[PDB]
């Protein structure tokens, strides 16, 4: 936000970190190893237990 | 591997079949890794999970 670096998109080639419960949960990111990606979802959803 | 559909309960043979054959099935990361699968969430009134 303040414009050091350049967030990247949800690319769905990204593997998702098991072990934490996403169970509830509506935004998390997770810095990648080329970047930095986000996973979000729409108004009235959540992740499941295994995201 | 088993497949089952929730709410429903076992799928027929077309489907699991389809499941694990193509490659473009929907499963576990234990599948994904194995078999491979696609995950772009389109648009589907129902689908076989296998785990």
Known sequence: ?51 | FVCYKAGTGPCSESEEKTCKTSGSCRGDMQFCKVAGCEHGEEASEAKCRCS
């Open chain 1, 1 to 51: 936000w303040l414009g050091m670096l350049v967030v990247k998109k949800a690319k769905g080639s990204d593997m998702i970190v098991p072990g934490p419960s996403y169970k509830g949960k509506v935004f998390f990111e997770r810095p990648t190893f080329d970047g930095y990606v986000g996973w979000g979802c729409s108004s009235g959803k959540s992740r499941t237990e295994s995201g």
